[PDB]
C-alpha cells in the first residue's frame with residue numbers, strides 16, 4: 001500500500017530507492033537524481049486524498065528559498081495518481097541525535113548553538129506569513145555534505161497555517177481551533193484549542209531546549225493530550241530553568257507576555273542564546289556533541 005514502489009521513476013528523472021518516512025497525509029522517499037547523480041528527498045501525496053496539503057507545503061518551501069536552514073527546492077508536479085515535491089536530502093534529526101547521547105542530554109554548547117539555528121528558521125517561516133505549529137526535535141535535521149554538516153534544517157510544513165491575509169494583515173483567530181500537533185512541546189494555548197500564533201512556535205522551542213540540556217520534561221511519561229495540558233497549566237515554569245542559564249528567564253518572561261496578535265521579539269531571544277554562550281566562552285566553531293571532536 002506504498003504510493004511508489006522501489007525503482008519507480010518520477011518524470012524520467014527521480015528513481016525511488018526506498019521509503020524514509022510515512023504517515024496519514026503522505027510519504028517521503030530517498031530517490032536518485034538520474035541527471036545530477038545526487039540522491040534527493042521525494043515527498044508524495046495521493047491524488048485522491050481528501051485533505052490536499054502538499055500544494056501549501058511547496059508554496060511555503062518556495063517562499064523560503066534563499067534563507068538559511070531551508071532545503072533547496074528541486075521540482076514539483078501533479079498527475080492522476082500522486083502529487084510530489086523533490087527537495088534537498090538532509091541527514092540525522094535532533095531527536096535521534098539526542099537519544100544517541102549517553103544520558104539523552106546535549107552539552108550547553110550544542111544546545112545553545114542549535115537554539116540559534118532553530119530560532120532563525122522559526123523567524124524565517126513567520127517572515128513569509130506562516131506558522132509551523134509542530135516545532136519539535138524530529139522536525140530539524142543536520143546536513144549531510146562538507147558544506148552543510150554543521151547546519152540544521154527545518155522539515156515538515158504539513159501542519160503549517162498562513163496567519164496573514166492576501167494583503168499582509170494578521171487574520172482573525174478562530175474562537176476554537178483543534179490542536180492536531182505533537183503533545184510534548186505544545187504550548188498551553190494549543191492545549192486549550194485556541195488559535196495558535198507565532199509565540200506558540202517559540203513555546204515549542206523553549207520546551208525543546210530545556211529537554212536538550214536537562215534530558216527530560218516533567219510530563220514525558222504522560223501521552224494523553226488533556227492530562228499533559230493540565231500538568232503544563234499549573235507547572236511553575238521557572239523550575240524548568242533551575243539547571244539552565246539565568247538569561248533563559250528573559251526568554252520565558254517574553255514569550256509568557258505574548259498573545260496571538262503580538263509580533264515576538266526574536267532579537268531578545270537570540271541575545272539570550274548569544275549572551276549565554278559569551279558568559280561560558282562557548283565559540284560558534286566548537287564541535288557538536290555527535291562529532292569525533
Ligand SMILES: CCC(O)(C#Cc1ccc2[nH]c3c(c2c1)-c1nc(N)ncc1CCC3)CC
Nearest residue numbers: 020021028041057058061088089090155156157
Ligand atoms: C515541501 C515539503 C516539506 O514541507 C517537507 C517535509 C518532510 C516531512 C516529513 C519528513 N520525514 C523525513 C523527511 C521529511 C520531510 C526528510 N526530508 C528531507 N528533505 N531530508 C531528510 C529527511 C529525513 C527522513 C524523514 C518542506 C520542509
